């Protein structure tokens, strides 16, 4: 019956202003509890804070209260995180939340609906495209394209426009010290295929409006 | 804060097992506990509240029990949509606190990775900074270890990893390890090698190139 949808900026500089709302539907906006949780990349779960759809008074996560701010929208029956004064560190993926509690003195909340969520990286680089390097050298071989020091992410990779599917592997990209991803993509073909056919990996990166087409051989 | 700590981090099972999977809290909490089941990029959903009480949908083979500090969700006969990550979480105060999760992945039959070696590029040498990488593929379990070694001393720092989640088709990981030197320290050497150990592999198995070779 409840439905949660997250929306926000996708990424946020240093020292701002983070913020993102909760479209409420289906049910009663104030006759329920509504609040946010986040998840760091490599960390846990984390309860920001939960506020009472008819009054706007709630409870806030000591952690975060100084720089949180969770409010309501009546007329589009909407929740809104602010988060002030961001760093990396509050990169995450965002959730909104039902909370639910209990005559135990009442407990604290569980949480019984949550929305997809919406992630969020705080950081101060500039666009860039990617630099791509082939990666070249029994019965198989390996062969990949290293994709390295672009941003934002994604960068999409394919194999031969697409006519090489089997045994692609494209790694999760990484965040390197100088705040910019690195991944590779790799694939495995017949080591007597190499020098009578080609293969090419082509590298998609939309928000740079990049396009590299890399042929990867033997040296 | 109440600390919540779940074991183990992970756990591979079968279709048709029984798993149990255990929360543990630095103070007591009675039964306040509730346990999510997320799946990757999707809404957590509530499986469990109260310590043992079913949410609303969840099927029956789930089940939740445990008072005061230590606590288990046990899933029986595991059907192919339970492969995914569990949090269990404390709500008998605030702020409400989350363990740091278990994964339970697909179990199969163990599987040696396929080591291969990749020697920075002439166009990569020229920009002043290169990546060695290193990649371990098709293998089961996860559990890896992958060695540098640069004129045959272990070299620390400077690599970073990278793991696929298991595969679709065959259930297996695949890794990469890459090691990010400055051109300059790069031509300071000559022999390059991974070396990998693994529990389908009675020796490690170790992988090599020549500067420039």
């Known amino acids: 019956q409840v439905q949660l949808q997250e929306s926000g900026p996708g990424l946020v500089k240093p020292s701002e202003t983070l913020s993102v709302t909760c479209a409420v539907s289906?049910?009663?906006?104030?006759?329920?509890?509504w609040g946010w949780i986040r998840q760091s990349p490599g960390k846990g779960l984390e309860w920001i804070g939960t506020?009472?759809?008819?009054?706007?008074?709630?409870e806030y996560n000591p952690s975060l209260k100084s720089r949180t701010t969770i409010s309501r929208d009546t007329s589009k029956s909407q929740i809104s995180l602010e988060l002030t004064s961001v760093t990396a560190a509050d990169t995450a993926i965002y959730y909104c939340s039902r909370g639910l509690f209990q005559p135990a003195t009442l407990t604290s909340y569980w949480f019984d609906v949550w929305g997809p969520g919406v992630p969020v990286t705080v950081s101060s680089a500039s666009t860039k495209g990617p630099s791509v390097f082939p990666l070249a050298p029994e019965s198989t071989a390996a062969l990949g394209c290293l994709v390295k020091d672009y941003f934002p992410e994604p960068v999409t990779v394919s194999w031969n426009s697409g006519s090489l599917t089997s045994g692609v592997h494209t790694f999760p990209a990484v965040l390197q010290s100088s705040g910019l991803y690195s991944l590779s993509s790799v694939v495995t073909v017949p080591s007597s295929s190499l020098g009578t056919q080609t293969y090419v990996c082509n590298v998609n990166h939309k928000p740079s409006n990049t396009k590299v087409d890399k042929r990867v051989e033997i040296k | 804060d109440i600390q919540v700590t779940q074991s183990p981090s992970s756990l591979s099972a079968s279709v048709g097992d029984t798993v149990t999977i255990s929360c543990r809290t630095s103070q007591s909490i009675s039964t306040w506990l509730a346990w999510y089941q997320v799946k990757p990029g999707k809404a957590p959903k509530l499986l469990i509240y109260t310590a043992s009480s079913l949410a609303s949908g969840v099927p029956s083979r789930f089940s939740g029990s445990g008072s005061g500090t230590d606590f288990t969700l046990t899933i029986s006969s595991l059907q192919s949509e339970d492969f995914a990550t569990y949090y269990c979480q404390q709500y008998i105060s605030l702020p409400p606190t989350f363990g740091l999760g278990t994964k339970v992945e697909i179990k199969r039959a163990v599987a040696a990775p396929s080591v291969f070696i990749f020697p920075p590029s002439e166009d990569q040498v020229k920009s002043g900074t290169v990546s060695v990488v290193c990649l371990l593929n098709n293998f089961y379990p996860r559990e890896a270890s992958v060695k540098w070694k640069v004129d045959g001393v272990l070299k620390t720092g400077n690599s970073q990893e990278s793991v696929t989640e298991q595969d679709s088709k065959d259930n297996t990981y695949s890794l990469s390890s890459t090691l990010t030197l400055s051109n300059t320290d790069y031509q300071s050497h000559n022999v390059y090698a991974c070396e990998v150990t693994h529990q389908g592999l009675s020796s490690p198995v170790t992988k090599s190139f020549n500067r420039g070779e």
């Open positions: 289906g049910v009663s906006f104030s006759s329920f509890w």
């Open positions: 506020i009472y759809g008819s009054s706007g008074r709630g």
